[PDB]
Amino acid sequence: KFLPDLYDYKENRFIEIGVTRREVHTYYLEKANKIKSEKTHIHIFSFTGEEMATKADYTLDEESRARIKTRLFTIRQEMASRGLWDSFRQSERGEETIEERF
Amino acid sequence: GDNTKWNENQNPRMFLAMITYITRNQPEWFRNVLSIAPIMFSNKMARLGKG
Numbered sequence: 001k002f003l004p005d006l007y008d009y010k011e012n013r014f015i016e017i018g019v020t021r022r023e024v025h026t027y028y029l030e031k032a033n034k035i036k037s038e039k040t041h042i043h044i045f046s047f048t049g050e051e052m053a054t055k056a057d058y059t060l061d062e063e064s065r066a067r068i069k070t071r072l073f074t075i076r077q078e079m080a081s082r083g084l085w086d087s088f089r090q091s092e093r094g095e096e097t098i099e100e101r102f
Numbered sequence: 103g104d105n106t107k108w109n110e111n112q113n114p115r116m117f118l119a120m121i122t123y124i125t126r127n128q129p130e131w132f133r134n135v136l137s138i139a140p141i142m143f144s145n146k147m148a149r150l151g152k153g
Contacts, residue, residue: 102131 004040011041011059018044019072021086024052045069047076114143 004014016035018027024044032042043053043060049069051058058065079085118140125133 100131102134 001038002035008059012039014038014040016040016042018042019046020044021047021076021089024050028052045072047072047079049073114140114146118144 005017006015008015016031018031020027024046027044028042031044035042041054041059043051043058045051045068049072051065051069053059060068079089118137121136121140122133125136
Protein backbone atom coordinates (compact mmCIF):
# COMPACT_ATOMS: atom_id res chain seq x y z
CA LYS A 1 0.00 0.00 0.00
CA PHE A 2 2.86 2.39 0.77
CA LEU A 3 5.77 2.66 -1.64
CA PRO A 4 9.07 0.93 -0.84
CA ASP A 5 12.40 2.31 -1.97
CA LEU A 6 14.21 -0.49 -3.83
CA TYR A 7 13.60 -4.14 -4.67
CA ASP A 8 15.77 -7.25 -4.60
CA TYR A 9 15.06 -10.04 -7.08
CA LYS A 10 16.51 -12.91 -5.03
CA GLU A 11 14.72 -12.47 -1.69
CA ASN A 12 11.55 -11.02 -3.32
CA ARG A 13 11.11 -8.74 -0.31
CA PHE A 14 10.53 -5.03 -0.76
CA ILE A 15 13.10 -2.53 0.45
CA GLU A 16 12.35 0.38 2.77
CA ILE A 17 15.28 2.63 3.70
CA GLY A 18 15.33 4.66 6.90
CA VAL A 19 18.14 7.17 7.43
CA THR A 20 18.42 8.63 10.92
CA ARG A 21 20.30 11.08 13.04
CA ARG A 22 17.91 10.22 15.90
CA GLU A 23 18.16 6.96 17.89
CA VAL A 24 17.19 3.94 15.79
CA HIS A 25 14.45 2.60 18.07
CA THR A 26 12.51 5.72 17.23
CA TYR A 27 12.36 4.74 13.55
CA TYR A 28 12.01 0.96 14.01
CA LEU A 29 8.45 1.44 15.30
CA GLU A 30 7.76 4.76 13.58
CA LYS A 31 8.17 3.22 10.12
CA ALA A 32 6.68 -0.18 11.06
CA ASN A 33 3.08 0.96 11.48
CA LYS A 34 0.66 0.94 8.50
CA ILE A 35 2.99 -1.45 6.61
CA LYS A 36 2.42 -4.89 8.13
CA SER A 37 0.86 -8.10 6.81
CA GLU A 38 3.43 -7.60 4.00
CA LYS A 39 6.93 -8.89 3.21
CA THR A 40 8.57 -5.46 3.19
CA HIS A 41 12.05 -5.60 4.73
CA ILE A 42 12.69 -2.86 7.30
CA HIS A 43 16.33 -1.81 7.52
CA ILE A 44 17.39 1.46 9.16
CA PHE A 45 20.61 3.26 8.29
CA SER A 46 22.13 5.99 10.46
CA PHE A 47 24.48 8.95 10.45
CA THR A 48 26.21 7.65 13.58
CA GLY A 49 27.27 4.13 12.65
CA GLU A 50 24.46 2.07 14.12
CA GLU A 51 22.05 0.00 12.03
CA MET A 52 18.93 -2.12 12.54
CA ALA A 53 17.30 -4.65 10.19
CA THR A 54 14.25 -6.91 10.20
CA LYS A 55 14.71 -9.72 12.78
CA ALA A 56 18.45 -8.82 13.05
CA ASP A 57 19.26 -10.43 9.68
CA TYR A 58 21.42 -8.20 7.47
CA THR A 59 20.92 -8.76 3.75
CA LEU A 60 23.69 -6.31 2.85
CA ASP A 61 27.20 -7.72 3.14
CA GLU A 62 29.88 -6.58 5.57
CA GLU A 63 31.99 -4.49 3.16
CA SER A 64 29.03 -2.47 1.88
CA ARG A 65 27.45 -2.14 5.33
CA ALA A 66 30.75 -0.72 6.56
CA ARG A 67 31.01 1.46 3.43
CA ILE A 68 27.58 3.10 3.67
CA LYS A 69 27.66 3.76 7.42
CA THR A 70 31.09 5.34 6.93
CA ARG A 71 29.73 7.54 4.12
CA LEU A 72 26.72 8.44 6.27
CA PHE A 73 29.29 9.22 8.95
CA THR A 74 31.08 11.23 6.26
CA ILE A 75 27.66 12.79 5.67
CA ARG A 76 27.49 13.21 9.46
CA GLN A 77 30.99 14.69 9.84
CA GLU A 78 30.79 17.08 6.88
CA MET A 79 27.43 18.22 8.24
CA ALA A 80 29.23 18.65 11.57
CA SER A 81 32.37 20.26 10.12
CA ARG A 82 30.26 22.72 8.11
CA GLY A 83 28.75 24.40 11.16
CA LEU A 84 25.15 23.32 10.66
CA TRP A 85 24.79 19.79 11.95
CA ASP A 86 21.65 18.47 13.69
CA SER A 87 19.32 21.01 15.34
CA PHE A 88 17.56 22.42 12.27
CA ARG A 89 17.44 18.88 10.83
CA GLN A 90 15.04 17.65 13.51
CA SER A 91 12.02 19.72 12.46
CA GLU A 92 11.30 18.78 8.84
CA ARG A 93 11.42 14.97 9.08
CA GLY A 94 8.25 15.07 11.16
CA GLU A 95 6.83 18.08 9.29
CA GLU A 96 6.55 17.07 5.63
CA THR A 97 2.90 17.81 4.94
CA ILE A 98 0.92 20.25 2.80
CA GLU A 99 2.18 23.77 3.44
CA GLU A 100 1.20 25.67 0.25
CA ARG A 101 2.67 29.07 0.93
CA PHE A 102 0.63 30.85 -1.75
CA GLY B 103 -38.23 40.37 -15.21
CA ASP B 104 -35.17 40.97 -17.29
CA ASN B 105 -32.04 42.88 -16.44
CA THR B 106 -30.90 45.49 -18.91
CA LYS B 107 -27.18 46.05 -19.51
CA TRP B 108 -26.43 43.20 -17.11
CA ASN B 109 -22.79 42.83 -18.05
CA GLU B 110 -21.65 46.44 -18.04
CA ASN B 111 -23.23 47.18 -14.66
CA GLN B 112 -21.35 44.53 -12.77
CA ASN B 113 -17.98 45.25 -11.36
CA PRO B 114 -15.43 42.61 -10.38
CA ARG B 115 -14.60 44.78 -7.40
CA MET B 116 -17.74 43.58 -5.70
CA PHE B 117 -17.01 40.09 -6.96
CA LEU B 118 -13.91 40.39 -4.80
CA ALA B 119 -16.21 41.63 -2.05
CA MET B 120 -18.20 38.43 -2.38
CA ILE B 121 -15.38 35.90 -2.57
CA THR B 122 -13.62 37.59 0.31
CA TYR B 123 -16.78 37.05 2.32
CA ILE B 124 -17.85 33.61 1.16
CA THR B 125 -14.43 32.39 2.10
CA ARG B 126 -14.70 33.53 5.72
CA ASN B 127 -12.23 31.94 8.18
CA GLN B 128 -10.75 29.77 5.40
CA PRO B 129 -7.00 29.11 5.03
CA GLU B 130 -4.70 31.86 3.85
CA TRP B 131 -3.64 30.15 0.63
CA PHE B 132 -7.20 29.31 -0.33
CA ARG B 133 -8.66 32.76 0.20
CA ASN B 134 -5.71 34.09 -1.73
CA VAL B 135 -6.01 31.85 -4.80
CA LEU B 136 -9.69 32.59 -5.33
CA SER B 137 -8.90 36.27 -5.00
CA ILE B 138 -6.62 36.70 -7.99
CA ALA B 139 -9.38 36.32 -10.54
CA PRO B 140 -11.58 39.24 -9.35
CA ILE B 141 -8.37 41.23 -9.13
CA MET B 142 -7.27 40.61 -12.68
CA PHE B 143 -10.75 41.23 -13.91
CA SER B 144 -10.71 44.56 -12.14
CA ASN B 145 -7.63 45.58 -14.07
CA LYS B 146 -8.55 43.90 -17.34
CA MET B 147 -7.79 45.51 -20.66
CA ALA B 148 -9.95 44.59 -23.62
CA ARG B 149 -8.42 44.65 -27.04
CA LEU B 150 -10.26 46.46 -29.76
CA GLY B 151 -10.60 43.63 -32.26
CA LYS B 152 -9.48 43.98 -35.86
CA GLY B 153 -10.06 47.56 -36.86
